[PDB]
Nucleic acid binder design. Structure first.
Lengths: 488, 488
RNA sequence: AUUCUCUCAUAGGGAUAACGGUGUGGCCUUCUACCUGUUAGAAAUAAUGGGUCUUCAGUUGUAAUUCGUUGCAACUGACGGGGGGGUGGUGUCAAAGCCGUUUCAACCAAGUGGUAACUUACUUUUACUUGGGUUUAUACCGUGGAAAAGCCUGAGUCUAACUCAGGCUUUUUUGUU
RNA sequence: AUUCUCUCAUAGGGAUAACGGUGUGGCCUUCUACCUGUUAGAAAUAAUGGGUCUUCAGUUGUAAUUCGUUGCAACUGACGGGGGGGUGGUGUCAAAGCCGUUUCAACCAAGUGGUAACUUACUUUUACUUGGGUUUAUACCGUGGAAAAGCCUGAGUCUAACUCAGGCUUUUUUGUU
C-alpha cells in the first residue's frame, strides 16, 4: 500500500462525496420547486441551481475537476511528500460574525489538501487516542460532545453544588506559537512518525501562527498543544471539556476552580498567547441560595443543564418554534397573502392539502416522519427498533417533561391560530370555509379530530408531540446508548 | 433482528472458532510428531491427540455438539430470556495456584452461556464506555493494558519522584455483595436496559457472591462495581489502573496516595468486603535517595518500569532464556542423550540439520521468522511494513538497550556451549565432528560465520538479535502505535 | 464533458456521447398485538380494507426471593403552553391567589421604542430524514446533438434590397430515463 | 457422525457417507536499494543464481528557515552478556580497579543445602506465527466401509474336535485428498 494509492483513494472519496452532495442538492431543489409551484401557483418563483462559490476560486476546490484528474493530483502530491516539498494551498477562508461579536474563521482547504489532512491526522488521532483527554472535541456539532454533556449533567445532579467556569480559546488557536506546537511533538508519549511531522509542519507552514479551526487537523494540534493544560487540570482534580474554541471546567470545590484559573493563565503565558473567560459561578439546587455569584442553569451547546434536569436552551426552543411556525406560515398563510391566487388550490370539500403538507413537514422536522403508532410499538415492545431522526435526535439527553409539554401546547395553539388566519384570508378572497374540517376545530379539539382522520389508511393528520418521541428517546438511550441513537 | 437470530449467530461463531482451534491443534500435533520422529529416531514417542477434558463434563461444553444443535439451543435460550427464566449453567471451574499462594478461580462457561455473555456484556461495555475509567482491564493478557503501562512509564520519566501503591482486589470480586452491584445499576449515567439487567442478575444468580473473573462479564461488572472508587480516586488526583485482580495507583504526592488508601478502605467497607495491598513506595531516579521505603523498579506485568527505562521483568527474561535454551537442548543435546541413536541423522559434511532447526525455532520465537534483511529493509525505508510477531511483540514498550544487548550475548554463548556439548556427545557415540562447520566456530565467530552461510539463497543461520527487532519495534511504534503492532 | 484514455502529471493532451443522481410504485426481507367484513378454503391461512390500545408513578393482593428485586391482576394520578381585554364564582377583614366563561393574537412576543417578513433564507454546527438492497413510470446537474428567434461582424450584386459566411445570447424535444 | 434434515427444541428423532482443517509448491498481487554472469534481445527489459549495506548519536561544511527545525555530503562513537579456576601487563605506598591470555560450564546458575530434567510440559495470560486470497502432491480430528488377528457368550453333531450366530478390543488400505 504505497502513499500514492492512499492519496488517490482518499481524494477520490472526498470528491465523490461532494459530487453526491451536489447531485442531491439540485435534485432536492427541483422537487422543492415542483411543490412550490403547486403551493404558490403562478406567483411561485423559478428554480435557480447554484454551485458553491469557492468552486471557482480554484479548480481543486471543485469536486468534479478533482475527480477528473485525481490520479495526477495524487501522483504529484506523493512526490511532493516524498521529496519533502509539499505545502497545502491556501484554504478558502471566510471569517464569519460570532454572537459574542468575534469572528469564527471558517477555512476550507482544497479537496486534495483536505484529503491529505484526513488521511494523516485521522491516523495520528487514532494512534494517540489514549494520550488525549476524554472530553476534547474539535467541532461544536461533534456528536460525541453529548458524552461530555452527560458527564456534567450527571455531576450536576449527584453534586448538588458544583462550581463551574467557562473559557474561550479562540485567540489561542488563532495565534499559538508554532514553536510551542513543535516542542510538544516528542512529549506525553505521542507517536508522530517523521512523515506525519513533516505534514504537520507543512500545514503549519501554509499558515503562519495558529491552528486552522474547524478542519481535519484541528483536533490533533489542539490536543497536542493542550496536553499539559489537560494534565495539570486533571491533577488538580477538576473535570473539563473542550469543544471547538470553548472550555468548561467544573468541580465540587471552589479552590479547585480557582487553581484551574491559575493553571490556564500559566499555560497561556507558556504559549505566548492569552485565554480569556467568556466566567466563574456555582450551580446549586433551585431554591437553595448561594454564596458566590451563582446561576442555576448552564448553557452547554443546545442544552440548558441544571441540577434537576437537562432541557433545551431557550435559543434552541426559539429556533424549533421558528421552524414549526414558518412551516405553517409557508403552507397555510403565505400563499394566500400573494397578489393573485392563480394556480393555488383552495381548501374545499373538508380537505386542506396545505394542512396535510404542513403537518407532515412538522412531523419530519420533529419525528423524522414517525407515526405515533410506530413510537408506541417501540415503547410497548411490539417493535424492537425505532429510527430516531428529526430535531429531537439533536437533543437526546433532554429530561424536562414540562418543557416538552409546553411545546406541545404551543404547537396546538399555533396550528389553531394559523388555520384561523388562513380561514380569514380565504374568506377575504371569497372562499367561506369556517364550517369545513380544517377551520371548524376548536383548539381543544384539534389533536383528537386529527388523530381520528385517516388518509390512505394512514393517520397523517396527527399533531406531532414532543413527549411521545421523548419517551421513545429515553427507551432508546437505555437500549442502545447515545452513539446509536445519534447516528444509526 | 430477533434475539433468537442473534443468539444463533453468536453461539455458532463461538463453537466454530473452538472447532477451528481443535482442528489446528491436532494438525499441529501431527506435524510436530513428524518432526519429532525425525529428531528422536526410534526413541521418538507416539502421537496422543487429546480432547479438552471439560468437553465431557457436559455436552454443551463440546463445540462439536453445540454446532450440532445450536438452533435448538438458541431457540430455548431466547424463550428462556423472554420468559425471564434463563439461568446460566454452572461454569466448569478450576481453581489454580497463584504465585502469591492464593487461588485464581478459572471459570469456563458453556458455549451457549459464554456466547450470551459476549453478546450482551460486549454491548453493555460499548454503550457505557465513556462512563468507565481509562485504564480498567479484565484480563492481564489484555493487549490494551500496554496503554496503561505507557502512561505510568511516561509519568515515571517526567515525574522523577513518584509515589506508587499496589492493591489486590481478588477477594473483592470473589465475594462482592450482589446487592451493591444491583444498587449501582442506575447510577453514573449507566445505560442498562431491562433485559440486560435480567441477564446480569441471571449470571449473578448462577453465582451467589462475587463476580466471575476472567470471563466476558468480568469487565462490565467490575467497572460497574468500582465506579465510585474510580471517581473518588480521580477527584483525589491520583492516577490508577486496574488489571484483573490488581490495581496500581500512582501520584507525585504522598498525601494523595495515602488518601487513596483511605478511599479504598472506605469503598471496601461500603462493599462489605476487604481489599488488601500486595504496598506503598517511591520510585526515584536511580542514585537519588528516598525518604520513605523506596524502590527504583516496578513490576507491571512482564515489564520492569523505572524512572529511566522500560525493561523486561526478570521472570520474563528467565522465561525467554528458558525457551531458547530448551530449543537448543531439544534439537542439539536431547536426541543424543537417548539410549540409542537409531533413526537420528548425525551431523556430517559440515551440515547440522538440527542446528538449522534450532536457529529457525529461535528466530520464530524471537522475530516470528523475520530475516535481518527484512528488518533492515523496514528500518531503512525500503519496506513500508514489517510484521511484528514473536516474543518481542509482547514487550513493545521496552527501551532498555543494555538488557537486549546482554540477551544477545547470552544467545551466542548458549549456542556455543550447546554446540560444544553436542560435539562432545557425538564423539562419545563415535562421531568426531569438531572440525566441521557447526562445531568449529569460536564464540566470537558464530554470528559472522552464520550470517554468511546461505541455504536456498536465504540466510537461515543468522543468529537472531533482540536489538535489531527492538529498533524495528521502535520504528513501528512511531509509525503505527501500540495497537497496530500488538495485533496486525 | 463531471465518461474513457495518454503524458516523469496539484498541469496539460486527445476520443466518444455518455456518466452521476432524484420522487413514486413493484419484488426480495428485517420486526409488528388484537377484533372484524369480504376474496380464495374445508377453520390451515394469505393478500387485502376498517377499527382499538400500546407509556410512566403509587397503593393493595398474590408467586418467586440468594433479601437489590422480579411476573400477574386491578384502582386512581398525571399524559397538548403562555399572554392581553372583559366577566362569573371562590376566599379572605381587604388582596395576592385560583377554579371557569368569552374575545384577540401565524411565530419570535411571558416582548420591542415599534412589528412584520423570511426557508436554495439567518446562523459559532443549529445539523439529518422515514430499516437494508434492486427496476416500470415522472424527472434532475453537467456535457453532446437538432430546430427556432434575436443581435453583431465580413463578403458578392449594390440607391434600396437580397444572398452567403463567422461569432454571441435565449427558448424548446431526445440517448440516462 | 462434527454432514443434512424434522420435532412448540440447553433435549430428542431420523437419512447419507461426507464435513472441517494442515505442510509443501503453483498462479493472482501487496512493498523492496545497488552490482553482476548467463537465457532470451537489438541496451527495452523479464524470469532466474550469487554478492554488498540498510540503524542510531555527535562534530563540521553547505542550502532553506516563519527561528521548533529541515535535505546533502563526510569524520568517528557505540552496534552479540555474565560467572568460576589459573595467568600476564598495568597502577597504585598496598589494593579496589581494569586492559588481555587460556580453560570450565546446554539454561535457570550473577545461585541452591544440591543440580538435573522438561515443550501436547510449568504457568496469575506468559500469550501469537512468516502481508491478503485460491489449487497439484503428503497429510490430520471425527464418522462411514472393507480385511485380518485375539477374547467372551450361545446353538448343532458331540469324548475330543469341527461348523454357525452374536458381542468386545487392536492393527491396516480408501471417498476429503
Amino acid at each position: 500500500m504505497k502513499l500514492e494509492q492512499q492519496i488517490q483513494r482518499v481524494i477520490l472519496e472526498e470528491a465523490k462525496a461532494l459530487i453526491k452532495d451536489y447531485h442531491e442538492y439540485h435534485n432536492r431543489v427541483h422537487l422543492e420547486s415542483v411543490r412550490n409551484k403547486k403551493r404558490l401557483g403562478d406567483s411561485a418563483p423559478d428554480k435557480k441551481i447554484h454551485r458553491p462559490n469557492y468552486w471557482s476560486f480554484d479548480k481543486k476546490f471543485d469536486p468534479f475537476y478533482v475527480k477528473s484528474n485525481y490520479k495526477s493530483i495524487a501522483r504529484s502530491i506523493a512526490n511532493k511528500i516524498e521529496n519533502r516539498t509539499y505545502l497545502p494551498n491556501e484554504p478558502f477562508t471566510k471569517d464569519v460574525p460570532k454572537p459574542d461579536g468575534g469572528i469564527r474563521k471558517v477555512s476550507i482547504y482544497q479537496i486534495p489538501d483536505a484529503a491529505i489532512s484526513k488521511l494523516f491526522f485521522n491516523r495520528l488521532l487514532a494512534k494517540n487516542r489514549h494520550r488525549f483527554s476524554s472530553f476534547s472535541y474539535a467541532y461544536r456539532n461533534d456528536r460525541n460532545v453529548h458524552f461530555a454533556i452527560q458527564d456534567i449533567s450527571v455531576d450536576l445532579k449527584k453534586n448538588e453544588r458544583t462550581f463551574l467556569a467557562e473559557f474561550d480559546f479562540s485567540d489561542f488557536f488563532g495565534s499559538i506559537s508554532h514553536s510551542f506546537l513543535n516542542e510538544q511533538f516528542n512529549e506525553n508519549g505521542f507517536y508522530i512518525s517523521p512523515e506525519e511531522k513533516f505534514i504537520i509542519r507543512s500545514f503549519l507552514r501554509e499558515r503562519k501562527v495558529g491552528i486552522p479551526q474547524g478542519t481535519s487537523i484541528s483536533l490533533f494540534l489542539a490536543n497536542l498543544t493542550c496536553w499539559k493544560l489537560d494534565q495539570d487540570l486533571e491533577r488538580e482534580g477538576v473535570k473539563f471539556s473542550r469543544y471547538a474554541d470553548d472550555t468548561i471546567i467544573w468541580s465540587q470545590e471552589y479552590s479547585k476552580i480557582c487553581n484551574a484559573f491559575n493553571i490556564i493563565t500559566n499555560f497561556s503565558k507558556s504559549a505566548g498567547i492569552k485565554i480569556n473567560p467568556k466566567g466563574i459561578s456555582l450551580l446549586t439546587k433551585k431554591g437553595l441560595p448561594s454564596e458566590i455569584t451563582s446561576k442555576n442553569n448552564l448553557d452547554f451547546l443546545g442544552y440548558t443543564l441544571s441540577v434537576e434536569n437537562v432541557s433545551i436552551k431557550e435559543k434552541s426552543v426559539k429556533k424549533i418554534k421558528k421552524q414549526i411556525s414558518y412551516i405553517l406560515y409557508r403552507n397555510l398563510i403565505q400563499p394566500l397573502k400573494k397578489t393573485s391566487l392563480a394556480g393555488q388550490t383552495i381548501p374545499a370539500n373538508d380537505r386542506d392539502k396545505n394542512f396535510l403538507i404542513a403537518i407532515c413537514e412538522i412531523r419530519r422536522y420533529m419525528y423524522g416522519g414517525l407515526s405515533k403508532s410506530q413510537i408506541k410499538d417501540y415503547l410497548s415492545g411490539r417493535s424492537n427498533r425505532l429510527y430516531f431522526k428529526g430535531i429531537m435526535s439533536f437533543y437526546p439527553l433532554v429530561n424536562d417533561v414540562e418543557q416538552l409539554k409546553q411545546l406541545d401546547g404551543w404547537i396546538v395553539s399555533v396550528i389553531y391560530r394559523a388555520l384561523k388566519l388562513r380561514c380569514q384570508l380565504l374568506s377575504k378572497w371569497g372562499y367561506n370555509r369556517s364550517h369545513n374540517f380544517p377551520f371548524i376545530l376548536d383548539r381543544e379539539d384539534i389533536v383528537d379530530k386529527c388523530s381520528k382522520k385517516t388518509i390512505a389508511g394512514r393517520k397523517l393528520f396527527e399533531i406531532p408531540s414532543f413527549l411521545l418521541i421523548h419517551k421513545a428517546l429515553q427507551k432508546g438511550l437505555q437500549e442502545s446508548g447515545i452513539e446509536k441513537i445519534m447516528n444509526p
